[PDB]
Design a protein around this ligand. Structure first.
Ligand SMILES: Cc1ncc(COP(=O)(O)O)c(CN)c1O
Ligand SMILES: Cc1ncc(COP(=O)(O)O)c(CN)c1O
Ligand code: NA
Ligand code: NA
Lengths: 452, 450
């Protein structure tokens, strides 16, 4: 009784992650064979415009010749190794030199992982290691914000501020979730944006005082929240919170997994939001989705502190088998070159005004509560009533319905809560952006005429 | 910085690297390899008797594997496996993994690493027991000297003293006695009594903790980073009925043992035990791509599917999970290991490997040799009769390994031991080269230390 179709084979042997099971049973797995520019093609030859770059990461599209050629060239040269025991590939040394150079840091050090989850988990371990070595083993608590997404390891899931993590009995103790700086959602009745930011700063200060600064290991933040539904922080947020963190000796980590390498219109989300973190977490665009790589980029202050702590014990007992893989490092060197030097990062800056202008027009509809975003990261929030910010009942699945209608029109859209997220590849043309918008509008025109 | 060595030190934060040796010797920057050899920036060639990190079983320039990697980049260079979408390569590999696993049926979940795969398996157990009305069933049983990875959870599962630097283990991670008879057997305790004690100890721990509070048990069939530790005779035959008696899922961590190293496709087959799930990585891609897999047997597959259908979505996964390049590479690595004579070369050469180690173990400073297939270790001692090791300050194993490097051999120092886990492509002449160089390093270091 062996399965025959691609659909039956997928269901017989897979355990699906982040997959809505009722939709999967109704529709069948969409099995993908190849891509062309920003388009993905399934086993039935159907072509979809992937307006999510796969998972934010495939910024150069699905068949970029330069990246394909750089990947092939490294397999022909040296197809694998590790970075332990005082050995490392030439590609690993070149990537660390490049990452420190492209980072906003004047100097620093890089530690490799395969994923963003491992890199966040690693940063947490580095902070525990460092503070205990400096005479404060109780300095262990990690501050993140509700709606944040930092990954799925037990630690990186505890840092994530998502209700679904209750199914794992998470967060673990020592993981503190601050108010999310989403003004439209979290601003109170009659609270101005300036008051809202001031309240976030008083809340952080009160939290640090109650918990005790000596028990707090670090603060992580995505400059613009990704999986939280594309959330640029309220005006002046980083300028209000960062002095408080610095006052209390709380290391500041920018989680640049999504924001690194151009999506917010700058190389780093921390540059767009004008703040200097002590370390950066990078992945995704780092390899343009061509290879699993994550990196922890430590600034000068933490680099110096960690090295003294490591010199004292003689060895830093942490690392992944594939950390610093020569193939991933060669691919990352090419992805960085493609994004920064081949006009991809510029294309986001050039097309962001037109992107915003079309979303502003779409937001005039009564069922759109707001549009939000920056550069090539945007969201449209669905509402039953605009003035009162009333959502549609959770059972109506408005965003999933918009997204399913988009799939049927040949557009890949991401439903998140009551929102629809767009994060297309940086290679997107004006015509393809018009294509993306026309199909989304037809899906909005259908779902809103139906539910409301 | 100008030199490769200075550039490496200026920009790297080194993991699992002895900093005094690094400052003394400089970073060894590798540019390429040939068969089982690695070549540095100075053109020096070393026989890598550790397959890089156990994983590069087909060597450093395998044409079939390089061609398979290139062909997938040309076809489809990347994608994910979320939201009901997945590459054709991901479906193919799941089908193949279930087939080659000892399970008649099952399901596969992907990760990038062995650490993520273990951390994932722990979350899966927390998820499952809570869904089945036992949210307190959270504790994880591992052994002292086990190595399961470096995420906070997989480091908590690892039984290494160095984890104290991170304030780890986290609560709820219980380390049972290591079934290494030579080290943990008491004075006057037979191997049979030793195994009976570890069974009694497991039962006592389950009874003290409460079976309803224990999520699962994980075991490497042969311990790897622990220093190549085959378990004491009849260990799994004594512990498994206890775990099954108390409803404690059994997970075989096959990250090193999967695909051939013990002389079988899985370490759990070599040790004649059926786990409920398998953790696979390393040989899975022959070190050509970061991939890990959780292979769920039929019982856990059914219970997890029921729990997932009840909440409608399993909210877990990594951006690169099921990457089509990793999947096309893993399909080729499995083909090379199982069909191109590599797994067979391990069985064919394991007797010669052991015969040579038995001769080396005659030396007064070798406490024991241990291992199986293509996984072995030699334990250095000051005194054989009393099992007295050399003082930690003498760094005997590091000295053996640094001497090996100076002779063009890469071998791994672990504790007071030296580990050999060479590629499956190793010829008899290359095995002779590995042992001749090792014996010269043993002669040099032992003559200096005593
Ligand atoms: C901001 C952010 N941080 C961390 C991660 C975790 O990265 P990975 O899926 O590679 O583990 C993600 C993944 N969506 C992310 O968006
Ligand atoms: C048995 C075992 N399990 C898990 C792991 C973790 O694998 P990774 O380094 O890919 O995280 C290792 C890695 N040495 C291992 O040997
Ligand atoms: Na810089
Ligand atoms: Na099978």
């Amino acid at each position: 009784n062996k399965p025959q179709s691609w659909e039956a084979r997928a269901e017989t042997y897979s355990l699906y992650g982040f997959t809505d099971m009722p939709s999967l049973h109704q529709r069948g797995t969409v099995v993908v064979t190849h891509g062309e520019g920003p388009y993905i093609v399934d086993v039935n030859g159907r072509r979809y415009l992937d307006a999510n770059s796969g998972l934010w990461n495939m910024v150069a599209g699905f068949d970029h010749k330069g990246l394909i050629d750089a990947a092939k060239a490294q397999y022909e040269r040296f197809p694998g190794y590790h970075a332990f025991f005082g050995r490392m590939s030439d590609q690993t040394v070149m990537l660390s030199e490049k990452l420190v150079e492209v980072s906003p840091f004047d100097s620093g050090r890089v530690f490799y992982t395969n994923s963003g989850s491992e890199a966040n988990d690693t940063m947490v371990k580095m902070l525990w290691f460092l503070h205990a070595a400096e005479g404060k083993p109780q300095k262990r608590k990690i501050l993140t914000r509700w709606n944040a997404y930092h990954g799925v390891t037990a630690v990186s899931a505890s840092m994530t501020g998502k209700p679904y993590n209750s199914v794992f009995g998470l967060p673990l103790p020592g993981f503190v979730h601050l108010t999310c700086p989403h003004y439209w959602r979290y601003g109170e009745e009659g609270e101005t944006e300036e008051q809202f930011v001031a309240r976030l700063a008083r809340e952080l200060e009160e939290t640090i005082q109650r918990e005790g600064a000596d028990t707090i290991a670090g603060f992580f933040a995505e400059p613009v929240m990704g999986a939280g539904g594309v959330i640029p922080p309220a005006k002046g947020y980083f300028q209000a919170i960062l002095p408080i963190l610095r006052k209390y000796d709380i290391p500041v980590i920018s989680d640049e997994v999504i924001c690194g390498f151009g999506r917010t219109g700058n190389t780093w989300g921390c540059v767009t939001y004008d703040f200097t973190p002590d370390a950066i977490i990078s992945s995704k665009n780092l390899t343009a989705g061509f290879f699993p790589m994550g990196a922890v980029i430590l600034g000068p202050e933490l680099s110096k502190r960690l090295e003294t702590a490591i010199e004292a014990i003689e060895e830093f007992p942490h690392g992944f088998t594939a950390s610093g893989h020569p193939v991933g490092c060669a691919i990352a060197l090419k992805a960085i070159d493609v994004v920064m030097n081949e006009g991809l990062a510029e294309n986001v800056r050039r097309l962001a005004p037109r992107f915003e202008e079309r979303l502003k027009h779409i937001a005039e509809r009564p069922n759109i509560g707001e549009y939000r975003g920056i550069g090539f990261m945007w969201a449209l929030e669905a509402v039953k009533d605009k003035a009162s910010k009333t959502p549609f009942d959770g059972n109506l699945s408005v965003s999933e319905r918009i997204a399913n209608t988009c799939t049927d029109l040949g557009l890949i859209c991401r439903p998140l809560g009551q929102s629809v997220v767009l994060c297309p590849p940086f290679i997107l043309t004006e015509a393809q952006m018009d294509e993306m918008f026309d199909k989304l509008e037809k899906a909005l025109d259908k779902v809103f005429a139906e539910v409301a």
